Amino acid sequence: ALRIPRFSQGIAQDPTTRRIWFGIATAHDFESHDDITEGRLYQNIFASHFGQLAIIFLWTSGNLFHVAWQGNFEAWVQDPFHVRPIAHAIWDPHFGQPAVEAFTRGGALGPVNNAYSGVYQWWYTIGLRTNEDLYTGAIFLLFLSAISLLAGWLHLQPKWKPSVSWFKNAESRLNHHLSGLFGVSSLAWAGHLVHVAIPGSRGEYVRWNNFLDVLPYPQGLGPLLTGQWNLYAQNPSSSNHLFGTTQGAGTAILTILGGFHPQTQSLWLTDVAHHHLAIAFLFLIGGLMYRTNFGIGHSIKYILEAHIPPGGRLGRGHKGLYDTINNSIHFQLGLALASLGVITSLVAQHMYSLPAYAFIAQDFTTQAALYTHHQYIAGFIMTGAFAHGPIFFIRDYNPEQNADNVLARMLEHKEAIISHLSWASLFLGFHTLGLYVHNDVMLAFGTPEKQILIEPIFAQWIQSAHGKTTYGFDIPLSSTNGPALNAGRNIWLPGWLNAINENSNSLFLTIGPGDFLVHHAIALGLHTTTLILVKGALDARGSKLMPDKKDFGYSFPCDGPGRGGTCDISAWDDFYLAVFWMLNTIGWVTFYWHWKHITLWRGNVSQFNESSTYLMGWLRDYLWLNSSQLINGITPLVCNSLSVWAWMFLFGHLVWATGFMFLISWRGYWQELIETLAWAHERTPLANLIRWRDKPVALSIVQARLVGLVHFSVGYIFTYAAFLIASTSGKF
């Protein structure tokens, strides 16, 4: 009764709307999908995870191709700084003639989007300003698009097959596979950020073409070899030298001491050309650490069963984890979002704190744009990163292949991590938040005089030793003559001081009071967007409520009245809740920043300092003020150029909102109703001869919590989204 679609009988014979949810939804679930040998999925992912490598590559061969059409770089070369950084060209056949009064913007001639993807600098940096010398990165990320779908087509063929073994092998996929993966990758890069960028920063149509008959460094390729180098660091490109130009263009190559010069406002070129050309050896040792064949280099193994120390004249005894991290893929999606977790957040300031190109530190639109983004994945990667962290538990782990060693133990003593990551918060519960409220009482009841704002004393130490010389406190180092800042008083440590503090530097920002009032708050968030996780994950191994969700799985929709003492219970629906409090914990640390930062770009830095230490401050003049440019580019006259979020925003402000019905409005109210008229339209003539291919039902309770989540967040990714941009194109 209904044979189609596929993967399993189960839901493919099933006769309601589900199928289509429960096709589409659970559609990369194959690793428990009745159709899969020990290869099949391992087999699968491969082509699969090329596959997109395809579009990522057609992500940009376009949008590269896209520009030079569109926008005005070959133009914008004549003068580089205003601006309304230029995105795409908008064929929207609904826009009222005021398309002029619409987006006749930048170089336009058409209602173009205001680009914020940063990139336009990341491309200016590598090399080009000649879009006739673009047209090509396009054609290149096509030279990679078709090319690599043969890695598709082809190495998805038993012949030039894969294996499985080949996949579990550890010391090759890794050891060998640092050396290539990163390593070499840089060099040429590390060198292109050396030998094709320099000659324009010197100023010279170096191109490809003239590709040897340059020789941008005078003394050929000698001292590299030999054992003598500093005829390189020799005369840095110099002091005023209008950037990528004439005068002060002090030839050199591989530099590593100067940094910025106000003008670029941004880490100066080919002085990270030595950077990328060093990291290298730091895997190219630990990079031939192990193997391919050859009988020399590492096993791992007694790395453990010996090296379980640090541990053991008691303790934990590892006798191998391994046949777990290598058998249990998850881990390979346990820790490859898990740790490309962090990176996201340690890219979430390096990238800003000191930029990397054609002016951003004073754009206040990437920062805005190219930040939060790079943050929300430090969300949407950092989160759902322990999810594949329950999994192995109820769906890879065997308590017996392991119950010697840490994990099972971790476990044995688990109902602890839970309850100290908890006391970690109820506290970061009342405080950072009790205090915080007469910092909102008084400030109301004419009494700011008295006030509990306790000013951070600690971060405080840092940010000075690491250079920063801004008022008070007679200690060493940054003394601007000090004995950690000596023995090394020249290496690394004039320049990274030469810019250390006046803010068009943003470098190590100007620490205010209540600075920790969010900072604390952000060491609340986390400790309480874990535990969720490290239950929704941890004890979500089984529990004792239903000491067998082990069978049950990860993604079981709630429970029903079962002995009044059960409900929403997926370790999944703890990731659900987990993705709430995390967007809460981003909820916050994007207020700060916007408050802060915003402050500066119009001088007024009482936009904090004065305020936040009592939240209407946030509400009033972080939240209330600045706006109605956006929400008055709509405003019963017209639209001008900030028109959109004035729409998008209320979008986010709708498309949020109704991730609510699904949410507050649970399950067996929908069927019941959607019967009482799934029925009405089954009676009423004329539109009687219409019996419908399958049969309308309401929605699995999971879903009815999922699309609560992707109307929501989608809404919520929206707005702040459009606001953070809107805002700034009025005010900066």
Binding site: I4, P5, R19, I20, G23, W91, P93, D694
Partner: peptide, 30 residues
């Protein structure tokens, strides 16, 4: 001759998905 590329947008929005909600109408009756 010249004026366009609209060619694309009345597709990508107008017929293309008109053909998405058309041929996987389906997935079911694919």
């Amino acid at each position: 001759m010249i004026n366009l590329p609209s060619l694309f947008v009345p597709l990508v929005g107008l017929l293309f998905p008109a053909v998405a909600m058309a041929s996987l109408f389906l997935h079911v009756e694919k």
